[PDB]
Amino acid sequence: SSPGIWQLDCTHLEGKVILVAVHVASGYIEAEVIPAETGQETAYFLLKLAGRWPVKTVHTDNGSNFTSTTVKAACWWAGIKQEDGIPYNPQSQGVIESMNKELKKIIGQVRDQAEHLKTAVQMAVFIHNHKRKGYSAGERIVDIIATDIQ
Amino acid sequence: SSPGIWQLDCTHLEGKVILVAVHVASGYIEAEVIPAETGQETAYFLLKLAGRWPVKTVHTDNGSNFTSTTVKAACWWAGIKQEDGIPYNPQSQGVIESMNKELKKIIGQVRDQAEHLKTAVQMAVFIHNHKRKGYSAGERIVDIIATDIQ
Ligand SMILES: Nc1noc2ccccc12
Ligand SMILES: Nc1noc2ccccc12
Structure with missing residues (x-):
C-alpha cells in the first residue's frame, strides 16, 4: 500500500552521516545527523519516524540494516514490514541520488547561517x-x- | 487558523527534560529528551517540527523561551508566529497536565523494554x-x- 511506503537513504558529508527517510509517493523526508550508521541508530530513527507517520513498509538502505537484529526489533515493535531496497526499477536509484545532491546543495547554501551540521540538515529538510x-x-x-x- | 497551532510543553522525569509539541486541534505530539531546556535546544526542536508539519503559530511554554533571542530567530527562520502560552481558557492547562501524566504512565509501562529514556519517550509518542x-x-x-x- 503506497501511502505507507518509505525508503531509507544514508548519505555522507563533512566526515558525518546523514540518515534520511523518504516517503516514496510524495518525496517528503525526515532526516538526522548521526555519528555513524549503526543498527542501534537506524532502529531509533525508525521508531521516531513510525511514531510520527503511518509507516507500513520500509525499504532498507543496505544489507547490514536489513540483517540487523536491532533494526528488525524496532520494525517489529513499530509494526513495520522490513524490506530490501533493491531498485528492481533502476530509475528509483537515480531519484535518490538526485535528492542527496539537492540536499547537499541546500546544506551548502545555509552554511553562513548554521554553526552545526545538524541545524543545516534540518534547514534542508524544511526547504x-x-x-x-x-x-x-x-x-x-x-x-x-x-x-x-x- | 487552528490547523497551524501548536503548543510547547516541558515536563521532567529521571532528572531529565522532555520537550513536547502538541498540535492543539488533534492532540498529536512530537517529543524529545534534552539535557536541559535552553533557548538553543528549544530553537532546534522548533526547526525540526516546522520542517515536518505546517507550523503557523506556537504557544511557547514559558517566558524564558518567549523572550529567547535564539527561539525568536528560529521562529523567524521557519515562518512561525511566536505567541505566549497563557491559558486565557483555563481548561487548557489541565489538558496538558493530563497529557504529561499519560505520557509518564506509558514511559513507565515500557521501561522493561527500553534501556535509555529517549527510546521510552519515542515509544510513548508512538503509543x-x-x-x-x-x-x-x-x-x-x-x-x-x-x-x-x-
Ligand atoms: N501522521 C500520521 N498520519 O496518520 C497517523 C497515524 C498514526 C500516527 C501518525 C500518523
Ligand atoms: N506535514 C505537512 N503537511 O503540510 C506540510 C507543508 C510543509 C511541510 C510539511 C507539511
Whole structure:
C-alpha cells in the first residue's frame, strides 16, 4: 500500500552521516545527523519516524540494516514490514541520488547561517518539504495519507 | 487558523527534560529528551517540527523561551508566529497536565523494554499518536491539515 511506503537513504558529508527517510509517493523526508550508521541508530530513527507517520513498509538502505537484529526489533515493535531496497526499477536509484545532491546543495547554501551540521540538515529538510513543484512534498504526503484514511 | 497551532510543553522525569509539541486541534505530539531546556535546544526542536508539519503559530511554554533571542530567530527562520502560552481558557492547562501524566504512565509501562529514556519517550509518542479515542491523533492531524489545504 503506497501511502505507507518509505525508503531509507544514508548519505555522507563533512566526515558525518546523514540518515534520511523518504516517503516514496510524495518525496517528503525526515532526516538526522548521526555519528555513524549503526543498527542501534537506524532502529531509533525508525521508531521516531513510525511514531510520527503511518509507516507500513520500509525499504532498507543496505544489507547490514536489513540483517540487523536491532533494526528488525524496532520494525517489529513499530509494526513495520522490513524490506530490501533493491531498485528492481533502476530509475528509483537515480531519484535518490538526485535528492542527496539537492540536499547537499541546500546544506551548502545555509552554511553562513548554521554553526552545526545538524541545524543545516534540518534547514534542508524544511526547504525540501516546503518546495513547490504546484504542490509541496508536505502537502502531497498529507493529501495521500488523508485520502487513504477516508 | 487552528490547523497551524501548536503548543510547547516541558515536563521532567529521571532528572531529565522532555520537550513536547502538541498540535492543539488533534492532540498529536512530537517529543524529545534534552539535557536541559535552553533557548538553543528549544530553537532546534522548533526547526525540526516546522520542517515536518505546517507550523503557523506556537504557544511557547514559558517566558524564558518567549523572550529567547535564539527561539525568536528560529521562529523567524521557519515562518512561525511566536505567541505566549497563557491559558486565557483555563481548561487548557489541565489538558496538558493530563497529557504529561499519560505520557509518564506509558514511559513507565515500557521501561522493561527500553534501556535509555529517549527510546521510552519515542515509544510513548508512538503509543500516544496511534491510540484510538473513533480516530487516533495521527489520523486527526492529517485530516485537519488535508481539509485546510483543500
Ligand atoms: N506535514 C505537512 N503537511 O503540510 C506540510 C507543508 C510543509 C511541510 C510539511 C507539511
Ligand atoms: N501522521 C500520521 N498520519 O496518520 C497517523 C497515524 C498514526 C500516527 C501518525 C500518523
